[PDB]
Structures are given as C-alpha cells and as structure tokens.
Amino acid sequence: KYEITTIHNLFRKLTHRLFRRNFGYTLR
C-alpha cells in the first residue's frame, strides 16, 4: 500500500515538488 506504487522510476521522482502533495494520500 506504500512501496507498491513505487517500482523503478514510477514514484522515483528525483524532484518531488508536486508529488509531495499527492503523497499525503498514500501516506495517510
């Protein structure tokens, strides 16, 4: 439910500036 979304480059965004706001949905 967490790392399941991140495989290789999917959620491996080196610059999580816009995804950081979305991560809140996966972390919580």
UniProtKB/Swiss-Prot annotation:
Name of the protein: Heparin cofactor 2
Family to which this protein belongs: Belongs to the serpin family.
Tissues expressing this chain: Expressed predominantly in liver. Also present in plasma.
Task performed by this protein: Thrombin inhibitor activated by the glycosaminoglycans, heparin or dermatan sulfate. In the presence of the latter, HC-II becomes the predominant thrombin inhibitor in place of antithrombin III (AT-III). Also inhibits chymotrypsin, but in a glycosaminoglycan-independent manner.
Region ranges (Glycosaminoglycan-binding site): 1-21
UniProt modification remark: Phosphorylated by FAM20C in the extracellular medium.
Domain of life, per lineage: Eukaryota
Disease: Thrombophilia due to heparin cofactor 2 deficiency: A hemostatic disorder characterized by a tendency to recurrent thrombosis.
Domain free text: The N-terminal acidic repeat region mediates, in part, the glycosaminoglycan-accelerated thrombin inhibition.
Species: Homo sapiens
